[PDB]
Short mmCIF file of C-alpha atoms in Angstrom, two decimals:
data_model
loop_
_atom_site.label_atom_id
_atom_site.label_comp_id
_atom_site.label_asym_id
_atom_site.label_seq_id
_atom_site.Cartn_x
_atom_site.Cartn_y
_atom_site.Cartn_z
CA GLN A 1 0.15 72.72 -37.71
CA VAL A 2 0.17 69.19 -39.16
CA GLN A 3 -2.58 70.86 -41.19
CA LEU A 4 -4.71 68.52 -43.28
CA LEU A 5 -6.99 70.11 -45.83
CA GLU A 6 -9.51 67.82 -47.61
CA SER A 7 -11.44 68.38 -50.83
CA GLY A 8 -15.10 69.50 -50.96
CA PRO A 9 -18.25 67.33 -50.53
CA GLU A 10 -19.08 64.84 -53.29
CA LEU A 11 -22.45 63.80 -54.74
CA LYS A 12 -22.21 60.58 -56.81
CA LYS A 13 -24.42 57.94 -58.48
CA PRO A 14 -23.90 54.15 -58.05
CA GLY A 15 -21.07 52.68 -60.14
CA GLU A 16 -19.18 55.95 -60.60
CA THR A 17 -15.68 56.73 -59.25
CA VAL A 18 -14.62 59.40 -56.72
CA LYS A 19 -11.20 60.84 -55.90
CA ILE A 20 -10.82 62.71 -52.60
CA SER A 21 -7.65 64.66 -51.80
CA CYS A 22 -5.86 65.60 -48.60
CA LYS A 23 -3.16 68.28 -48.74
CA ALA A 24 -0.75 68.18 -45.83
CA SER A 25 2.03 70.61 -44.92
CA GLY A 26 5.43 69.47 -46.14
CA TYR A 27 8.43 69.38 -43.78
CA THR A 28 6.71 66.51 -41.95
CA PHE A 29 4.82 64.74 -44.75
CA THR A 30 7.20 61.76 -44.74
CA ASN A 31 7.23 61.75 -40.94
CA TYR A 32 3.78 60.16 -40.59
CA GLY A 33 1.88 57.24 -42.07
CA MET A 34 -1.12 58.53 -44.03
CA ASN A 35 -4.17 56.57 -42.88
CA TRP A 36 -7.79 56.79 -43.94
CA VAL A 37 -10.90 56.14 -41.86
CA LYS A 38 -14.55 56.09 -42.85
CA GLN A 39 -17.46 57.20 -40.72
CA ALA A 40 -20.88 56.28 -42.01
CA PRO A 41 -23.72 58.56 -40.87
CA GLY A 42 -24.08 57.86 -37.15
CA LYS A 43 -21.86 54.79 -37.36
CA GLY A 44 -18.53 54.04 -35.71
CA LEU A 45 -15.08 54.80 -37.10
CA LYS A 46 -13.66 52.25 -39.54
CA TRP A 47 -9.96 52.16 -40.41
CA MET A 48 -9.58 51.66 -44.13
CA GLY A 49 -5.84 51.45 -44.28
CA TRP A 50 -2.78 53.61 -44.93
CA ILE A 51 -0.05 54.42 -47.38
CA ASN A 52 3.69 54.80 -46.76
CA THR A 53 4.76 58.36 -47.56
CA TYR A 54 8.40 57.26 -47.68
CA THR A 55 7.91 54.35 -50.13
CA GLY A 56 4.43 54.85 -51.54
CA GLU A 57 3.20 51.37 -50.57
CA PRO A 58 -0.48 50.94 -49.58
CA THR A 59 -1.84 48.54 -47.01
CA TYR A 60 -5.60 47.95 -47.22
CA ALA A 61 -7.81 46.75 -44.41
CA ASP A 62 -9.67 43.52 -45.21
CA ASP A 63 -12.96 45.38 -45.61
CA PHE A 64 -11.53 47.72 -48.23
CA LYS A 65 -9.66 45.46 -50.60
CA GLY A 66 -11.08 45.82 -54.09
CA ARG A 67 -12.64 49.14 -55.00
CA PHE A 68 -10.24 51.38 -52.97
CA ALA A 69 -6.98 52.92 -54.09
CA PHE A 70 -4.53 54.91 -51.86
CA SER A 71 -2.21 57.27 -53.74
CA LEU A 72 0.20 60.14 -53.08
CA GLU A 73 1.63 63.21 -54.76
CA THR A 74 4.81 63.66 -52.72
CA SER A 75 5.56 66.78 -54.78
CA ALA A 76 2.35 68.57 -53.80
CA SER A 77 2.45 66.98 -50.32
CA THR A 78 -0.99 65.60 -51.26
CA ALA A 79 -2.61 62.22 -50.51
CA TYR A 80 -5.60 60.81 -52.46
CA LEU A 81 -8.36 58.26 -51.94
CA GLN A 82 -10.23 56.80 -54.90
CA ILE A 83 -13.35 54.61 -54.73
CA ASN A 84 -14.65 53.11 -57.96
CA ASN A 85 -17.95 51.35 -58.68
CA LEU A 86 -19.47 53.45 -55.89
CA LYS A 87 -22.30 52.00 -53.75
CA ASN A 88 -24.96 53.60 -51.49
CA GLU A 89 -23.11 52.02 -48.56
CA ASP A 90 -20.03 54.10 -49.45
CA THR A 91 -22.03 57.18 -48.36
CA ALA A 92 -19.92 58.49 -45.48
CA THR A 93 -17.39 61.08 -44.38
CA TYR A 94 -13.82 60.11 -45.13
CA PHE A 95 -10.98 61.26 -42.89
CA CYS A 96 -7.38 61.49 -43.94
CA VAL A 97 -5.37 60.95 -40.71
CA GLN A 98 -1.63 61.39 -40.08
CA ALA A 99 -0.15 58.76 -37.76
CA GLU A 100 3.13 58.51 -35.86
CA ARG A 101 5.07 55.21 -35.67
CA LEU A 102 6.43 55.33 -32.11
CA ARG A 103 3.21 56.32 -30.38
CA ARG A 104 1.20 54.48 -33.02
CA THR A 105 -1.51 57.13 -32.72
CA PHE A 106 -3.80 59.01 -35.08
CA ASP A 107 -2.30 62.45 -34.29
CA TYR A 108 -3.82 64.84 -36.83
CA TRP A 109 -7.16 64.38 -38.56
CA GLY A 110 -8.36 66.14 -41.68
CA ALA A 111 -11.72 67.91 -41.69
CA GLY A 112 -13.31 64.94 -43.44
CA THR A 113 -14.78 64.75 -46.91
CA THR A 114 -18.42 63.80 -47.23
CA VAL A 115 -19.38 61.49 -50.06
CA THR A 116 -23.04 60.89 -50.91
CA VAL A 117 -23.90 58.05 -53.33
CA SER A 118 -27.40 58.10 -54.74
CA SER A 119 -29.42 57.58 -57.92
CA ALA A 120 -31.89 60.33 -57.00
CA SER A 121 -32.15 63.42 -59.16
CA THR A 122 -32.04 66.98 -57.82
CA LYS A 123 -35.53 67.83 -56.55
CA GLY A 124 -36.98 70.78 -54.70
CA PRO A 125 -39.17 70.00 -51.69
CA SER A 126 -42.91 70.31 -51.28
CA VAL A 127 -43.83 72.37 -48.20
CA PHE A 128 -46.95 71.49 -46.25
CA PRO A 129 -48.34 73.23 -43.15
CA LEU A 130 -48.48 71.52 -39.77
CA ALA A 131 -51.56 73.45 -38.56
CA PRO A 132 -51.95 74.40 -34.88
CA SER A 133 -54.71 72.44 -33.09
CA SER A 134 -57.92 74.10 -34.28
CA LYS A 135 -60.43 72.12 -32.20
CA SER A 136 -58.23 73.31 -29.32
CA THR A 137 -57.39 76.95 -30.11
CA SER A 138 -57.04 78.61 -26.69
CA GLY A 139 -55.13 76.15 -24.53
CA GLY A 140 -51.88 77.83 -23.55
CA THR A 141 -49.20 76.83 -26.05
CA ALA A 142 -49.96 76.08 -29.68
CA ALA A 143 -48.30 73.52 -31.97
CA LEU A 144 -47.48 74.93 -35.45
CA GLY A 145 -44.99 73.77 -38.07
CA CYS A 146 -43.94 73.00 -41.62
CA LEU A 147 -43.22 69.59 -43.22
CA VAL A 148 -40.57 69.97 -45.94
CA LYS A 149 -40.73 66.70 -47.81
CA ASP A 150 -39.32 64.88 -50.79
CA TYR A 151 -36.21 66.82 -51.73
CA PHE A 152 -32.74 65.91 -52.91
CA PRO A 153 -29.94 66.44 -52.06
CA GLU A 154 -29.22 67.91 -48.63
CA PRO A 155 -29.33 70.50 -47.23
CA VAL A 156 -32.38 72.64 -46.71
CA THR A 157 -32.52 75.69 -44.45
CA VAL A 158 -35.69 76.78 -42.68
CA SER A 159 -36.33 80.01 -40.81
CA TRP A 160 -39.54 81.39 -39.34
CA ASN A 161 -40.89 84.88 -40.01
CA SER A 162 -37.72 85.66 -41.96
CA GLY A 163 -35.67 84.94 -38.88
CA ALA A 164 -37.49 87.09 -36.34
CA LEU A 165 -38.81 83.90 -34.74
CA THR A 166 -36.22 81.55 -33.21
CA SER A 167 -37.32 80.67 -29.69
CA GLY A 168 -39.27 77.42 -29.42
CA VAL A 169 -38.20 76.56 -32.99
CA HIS A 170 -37.05 72.96 -33.57
CA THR A 171 -35.85 71.98 -37.02
CA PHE A 172 -35.23 68.24 -37.09
CA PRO A 173 -32.42 66.45 -38.93
CA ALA A 174 -33.59 65.14 -42.32
CA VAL A 175 -34.45 61.50 -42.74
CA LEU A 176 -33.71 59.44 -45.82
CA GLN A 177 -36.98 57.99 -47.04
CA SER A 178 -37.16 54.56 -48.74
CA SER A 179 -37.69 56.55 -51.92
CA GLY A 180 -34.19 57.98 -51.56
CA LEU A 181 -35.70 61.42 -51.01
CA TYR A 182 -35.18 63.41 -47.81
CA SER A 183 -37.95 64.76 -45.63
CA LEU A 184 -37.99 66.91 -42.48
CA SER A 185 -40.17 69.05 -40.28
CA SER A 186 -39.51 72.36 -38.49
CA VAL A 187 -41.88 73.08 -35.61
CA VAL A 188 -42.42 76.05 -33.22
CA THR A 189 -44.25 76.41 -29.91
CA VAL A 190 -46.18 79.71 -29.64
CA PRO A 191 -48.89 81.05 -27.30
CA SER A 192 -52.34 79.93 -28.34
CA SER A 193 -53.42 83.52 -27.79
CA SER A 194 -51.02 84.69 -30.50
CA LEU A 195 -52.82 82.45 -32.99
CA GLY A 196 -54.90 84.68 -35.22
CA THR A 197 -52.99 87.82 -34.34
CA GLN A 198 -49.42 86.71 -34.98
CA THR A 199 -48.88 85.41 -38.49
CA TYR A 200 -46.41 82.54 -38.96
CA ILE A 201 -44.52 81.84 -42.16
CA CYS A 202 -41.79 79.24 -42.52
CA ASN A 203 -39.04 80.17 -44.96
CA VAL A 204 -37.70 77.11 -46.74
CA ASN A 205 -34.79 77.25 -49.08
CA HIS A 206 -33.18 74.44 -51.04
CA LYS A 207 -30.17 75.80 -52.91
CA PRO A 208 -29.34 72.68 -54.94
CA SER A 209 -32.64 73.17 -56.78
CA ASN A 210 -32.75 76.94 -56.29
CA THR A 211 -36.12 76.38 -54.68
CA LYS A 212 -37.43 78.90 -52.16
CA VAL A 213 -40.88 78.74 -50.65
CA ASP A 214 -42.67 80.67 -47.98
CA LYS A 215 -45.61 78.98 -46.40
CA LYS A 216 -48.05 80.71 -44.12
CA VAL A 217 -49.16 78.28 -41.44
CA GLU B 1 -10.26 41.75 -35.22
CA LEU B 2 -10.07 43.09 -31.67
CA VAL B 3 -13.31 44.46 -30.19
CA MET B 4 -13.44 47.56 -27.99
CA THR B 5 -16.61 47.99 -25.97
CA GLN B 6 -17.20 51.44 -24.45
CA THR B 7 -19.53 50.98 -21.50
CA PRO B 8 -21.27 54.29 -21.02
CA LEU B 9 -23.00 54.74 -24.36
CA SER B 10 -24.22 58.11 -23.11
CA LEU B 11 -23.00 59.88 -19.99
CA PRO B 12 -25.14 62.64 -18.49
CA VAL B 13 -23.11 65.05 -16.40
CA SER B 14 -23.37 68.37 -14.62
CA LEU B 15 -20.81 70.99 -15.55
CA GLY B 16 -18.00 71.17 -13.00
CA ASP B 17 -18.47 67.50 -12.09
CA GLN B 18 -16.19 64.55 -12.86
CA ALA B 19 -16.80 62.21 -15.79
CA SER B 20 -15.57 58.64 -16.16
CA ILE B 21 -15.77 56.77 -19.49
CA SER B 22 -14.88 53.08 -19.76
CA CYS B 23 -13.26 51.02 -22.53
CA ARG B 24 -12.90 47.23 -22.55
CA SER B 25 -10.99 45.34 -25.23
CA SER B 26 -11.57 41.81 -26.55
CA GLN B 27 -7.90 40.87 -26.06
CA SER B 28 -5.05 42.31 -24.04
CA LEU B 29 -3.74 45.46 -25.73
CA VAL B 30 -0.33 44.79 -24.22
CA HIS B 31 1.97 44.56 -27.23
CA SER B 32 4.77 42.00 -26.98
CA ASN B 33 7.19 44.93 -27.06
CA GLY B 34 5.75 46.07 -23.74
CA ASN B 35 3.72 49.18 -24.56
CA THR B 36 -0.08 49.22 -24.47
CA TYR B 37 -1.36 51.19 -27.46
CA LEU B 38 -4.72 52.32 -26.14
CA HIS B 39 -5.62 55.94 -27.02
CA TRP B 40 -8.59 58.29 -26.41
CA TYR B 41 -10.18 60.75 -28.82
CA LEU B 42 -12.99 63.31 -28.55
CA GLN B 43 -15.06 64.23 -31.60
CA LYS B 44 -17.41 67.23 -31.48
CA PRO B 45 -20.36 67.68 -33.88
CA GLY B 46 -19.17 68.68 -37.34
CA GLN B 47 -15.54 68.28 -36.29
CA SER B 48 -12.90 65.65 -36.92
CA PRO B 49 -11.82 63.52 -33.96
CA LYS B 50 -9.01 64.83 -31.75
CA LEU B 51 -6.33 62.86 -29.95
CA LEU B 52 -6.49 63.39 -26.19
CA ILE B 53 -4.66 60.53 -24.51
CA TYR B 54 -2.16 58.02 -25.95
CA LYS B 55 -0.64 54.81 -24.57
CA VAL B 56 -3.17 54.66 -21.73
CA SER B 57 -2.16 57.79 -19.75
CA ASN B 58 -0.07 60.14 -21.88
CA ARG B 59 -1.73 63.44 -22.62
CA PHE B 60 -1.16 64.65 -26.15
CA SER B 61 0.26 68.14 -26.66
CA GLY B 62 -2.15 70.92 -25.72
CA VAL B 63 -4.62 68.74 -23.86
CA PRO B 64 -5.99 70.21 -20.54
CA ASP B 65 -4.72 68.35 -17.47
CA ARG B 66 -8.26 67.70 -16.25
CA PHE B 67 -8.17 64.80 -18.76
CA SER B 68 -6.47 61.68 -17.46
CA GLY B 69 -6.33 58.00 -18.41
CA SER B 70 -5.79 54.67 -16.63
CA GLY B 71 -6.00 50.89 -17.17
CA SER B 72 -3.54 48.07 -17.90
CA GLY B 73 -4.50 45.09 -20.06
CA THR B 74 -8.06 44.81 -21.29
CA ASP B 75 -9.73 47.46 -19.15
CA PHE B 76 -9.14 51.21 -19.45
CA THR B 77 -10.70 54.40 -18.11
CA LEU B 78 -10.70 58.04 -19.15
CA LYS B 79 -11.54 60.55 -16.44
CA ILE B 80 -12.36 64.24 -16.72
CA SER B 81 -12.19 66.21 -13.48
CA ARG B 82 -14.48 69.23 -13.63
CA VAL B 83 -16.36 68.91 -16.92
CA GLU B 84 -16.49 72.04 -19.08
CA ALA B 85 -18.90 72.95 -21.85
CA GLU B 86 -16.15 72.59 -24.43
CA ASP B 87 -15.68 68.97 -23.26
CA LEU B 88 -19.14 67.88 -24.50
CA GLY B 89 -19.05 65.49 -27.44
CA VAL B 90 -18.33 61.84 -28.29
CA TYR B 91 -15.34 60.07 -26.76
CA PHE B 92 -13.72 57.19 -28.63
CA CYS B 93 -11.11 54.79 -27.32
CA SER B 94 -8.83 53.14 -29.86
CA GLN B 95 -6.24 50.35 -30.00
CA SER B 96 -3.18 50.16 -32.22
CA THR B 97 -1.61 47.09 -30.64
CA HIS B 98 -3.34 44.42 -32.78
CA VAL B 99 -3.36 43.70 -36.55
CA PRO B 100 -5.97 46.23 -37.74
CA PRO B 101 -6.34 49.40 -35.59
CA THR B 102 -9.85 49.52 -34.17
CA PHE B 103 -12.04 52.08 -32.39
CA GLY B 104 -14.55 51.71 -29.57
CA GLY B 105 -18.16 52.62 -30.30
CA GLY B 106 -18.14 56.06 -28.71
CA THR B 107 -19.48 57.58 -25.50
CA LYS B 108 -21.60 60.74 -25.69
CA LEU B 109 -21.01 63.16 -22.80
CA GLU B 110 -24.19 65.19 -22.23
CA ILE B 111 -25.70 67.70 -19.82
CA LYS B 112 -27.67 66.09 -17.01
CA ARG B 113 -30.76 67.96 -15.77
CA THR B 114 -34.18 67.31 -14.24
CA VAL B 115 -36.80 65.03 -15.75
CA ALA B 116 -39.12 66.77 -18.21
CA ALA B 117 -42.13 65.00 -19.72
CA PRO B 118 -42.72 65.87 -23.38
CA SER B 119 -45.51 68.10 -24.66
CA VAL B 120 -47.29 65.96 -27.25
CA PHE B 121 -48.80 67.35 -30.43
CA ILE B 122 -50.36 65.50 -33.36
CA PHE B 123 -50.82 66.80 -36.88
CA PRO B 124 -53.02 65.23 -39.58
CA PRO B 125 -51.99 65.50 -43.22
CA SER B 126 -52.84 68.76 -45.00
CA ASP B 127 -55.40 68.89 -47.81
CA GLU B 128 -52.67 70.03 -50.19
CA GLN B 129 -50.61 66.91 -49.46
CA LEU B 130 -53.52 64.47 -49.63
CA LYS B 131 -54.27 66.10 -52.97
CA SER B 132 -50.96 64.59 -54.13
CA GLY B 133 -51.61 60.96 -53.20
CA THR B 134 -49.73 60.93 -49.90
CA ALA B 135 -50.64 61.40 -46.26
CA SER B 136 -48.11 62.21 -43.58
CA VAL B 137 -49.18 62.25 -39.97
CA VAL B 138 -46.71 63.94 -37.59
CA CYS B 139 -46.39 63.39 -33.85
CA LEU B 140 -44.29 65.95 -31.94
CA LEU B 141 -42.68 65.32 -28.53
CA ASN B 142 -41.52 68.72 -27.21
CA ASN B 143 -38.65 69.52 -24.85
CA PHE B 144 -38.33 66.34 -22.79
CA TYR B 145 -35.64 64.66 -20.71
CA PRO B 146 -34.08 62.11 -20.60
CA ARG B 147 -33.85 61.33 -24.30
CA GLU B 148 -35.61 57.99 -23.94
CA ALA B 149 -39.18 58.13 -25.17
CA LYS B 150 -41.58 55.73 -26.82
CA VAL B 151 -44.01 56.74 -29.54
CA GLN B 152 -46.45 54.05 -30.65
CA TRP B 153 -48.79 54.79 -33.54
CA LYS B 154 -52.31 53.36 -33.76
CA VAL B 155 -54.72 53.48 -36.70
CA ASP B 156 -58.25 52.62 -35.52
CA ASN B 157 -56.64 51.04 -32.46
CA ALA B 158 -54.42 48.80 -34.58
CA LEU B 159 -50.77 49.21 -33.58
CA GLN B 160 -48.58 50.33 -36.46
CA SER B 161 -45.09 49.13 -37.24
CA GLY B 162 -42.51 49.74 -39.92
CA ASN B 163 -44.39 52.63 -41.53
CA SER B 164 -42.97 55.49 -39.46
CA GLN B 165 -39.68 57.41 -39.19
CA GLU B 166 -38.58 59.57 -36.25
CA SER B 167 -36.03 62.38 -35.88
CA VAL B 168 -34.56 63.82 -32.66
CA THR B 169 -32.85 67.18 -31.96
CA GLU B 170 -29.55 67.64 -30.15
CA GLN B 171 -29.80 68.59 -26.48
CA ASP B 172 -30.97 72.21 -26.31
CA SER B 173 -28.30 74.74 -25.30
CA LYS B 174 -30.56 76.73 -22.96
CA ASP B 175 -32.74 74.08 -21.33
CA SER B 176 -30.81 70.87 -22.04
CA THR B 177 -33.95 69.02 -23.27
CA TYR B 178 -34.57 67.06 -26.47
CA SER B 179 -37.39 67.21 -28.97
CA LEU B 180 -38.54 64.50 -31.37
CA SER B 181 -40.83 64.16 -34.39
CA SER B 182 -42.33 60.86 -35.52
CA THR B 183 -43.86 60.76 -38.96
CA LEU B 184 -46.37 58.10 -40.00
CA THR B 185 -46.55 57.79 -43.75
CA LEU B 186 -49.46 56.23 -45.70
CA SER B 187 -50.90 56.33 -49.17
CA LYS B 188 -53.95 58.59 -49.45
CA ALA B 189 -56.20 55.60 -50.14
CA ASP B 190 -54.98 53.66 -47.11
CA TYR B 191 -55.29 56.88 -45.12
CA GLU B 192 -58.89 57.34 -46.18
CA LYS B 193 -59.38 53.69 -45.29
CA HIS B 194 -59.31 54.42 -41.55
CA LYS B 195 -60.81 56.55 -38.79
CA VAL B 196 -58.73 57.21 -35.67
CA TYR B 197 -55.07 58.12 -35.91
CA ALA B 198 -53.21 58.33 -32.61
CA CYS B 199 -49.67 58.41 -31.33
CA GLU B 200 -49.07 57.21 -27.80
CA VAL B 201 -46.05 58.67 -26.12
CA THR B 202 -44.61 56.90 -23.11
CA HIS B 203 -41.80 58.86 -21.45
CA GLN B 204 -40.20 58.55 -18.00
CA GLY B 205 -41.70 61.95 -17.22
CA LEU B 206 -45.30 60.94 -17.87
CA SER B 207 -47.32 59.23 -15.12
CA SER B 208 -48.93 56.96 -17.70
CA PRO B 209 -48.44 56.90 -21.49
CA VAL B 210 -50.13 59.92 -23.05
CA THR B 211 -51.93 59.71 -26.39
CA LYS B 212 -53.02 62.50 -28.73
CA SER B 213 -55.33 61.83 -31.67
CA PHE B 214 -57.76 62.92 -34.37
CA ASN B 215 -59.98 60.80 -36.62
CA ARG B 216 -60.95 62.35 -39.97
CA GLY B 217 -59.45 61.01 -43.21
#
């Protein structure tokens, strides 16, 4: 199993401290080195360091000497990672990885704990229509969409016609605006002929703010 | 620090075909003890990485024999005979021979298909949005292939730069294409300060760059 179960996602503000846990199955806990690697959104994999499960001694990688602390709870077979004075650049997914000495490999990886550092306050999005070309009504396939902008934090879910419409639908990954607010669009390609007969409503839901909006397009 | 450069950043492949991913290290990964600690991992969207090959050619427990590895000092290769759908994801090479364990940059295995030019749609900001001081203009590039595309914005023929953000979907499961949205953001005043708004898409599937536009605002 080598099972590695990490703690839930974390939403933090700059300067705060976070403590992520990684529970491993005993009867093998002291048989691996407990490493930690960070993966920033769409970035490579960066080894942060590891801690000896037999002695409790941490070894930090040069890039993580200062605000990072590796700890263990040998009783609960649990390993912890703490980051204090959190920065936006700490935003990433942290993996707790068990490693074997002989092979010197990263054998089992945890699911990864996502940490998001931001000063933004919870905010529901504004939903604007992306109207199908009007000055070009009957031309085969129509455009159509919804722009769900300025919300925080992730995620947002968008369906069309309460889920009856899925083909042609393209909901793009959110983008972090310079304002620190996310924005995204969900589009759908329909037949121009259906415009006027077939009504289109995008269903946008943002749970963090308990915001739900339906927008006819 | 030792640098690992994975040659194929992205590798398009047809199912059933063979795949070959390359890894080159800055220094020899031949430890003085003899062994060469060069391993290969595959990470699928939303999942934690998974050890496939260790010490150049050793397949980790449970790994399908269609996965094999070669190489000796600073150059290594992972091969996959007959690619399967479950094999699609990002492959990382990794070294554990030198001081701090480092990872290569990743190679994305993807489905290779025929060239598809994008369907280009442009949306002006909605009255409701303008009414709030902002103006987002969205340019949609629908179901195209390969992923490479170029979307240049122009406001009254003046080429824009730095004021737009673009998002791209993951290869579609059914047709293996990609879709992309480029959003041009401007203040309402600046928006009402110009006439023609146009996005020019230039994709390998188009004969000549295509441009869609409007001009109100």
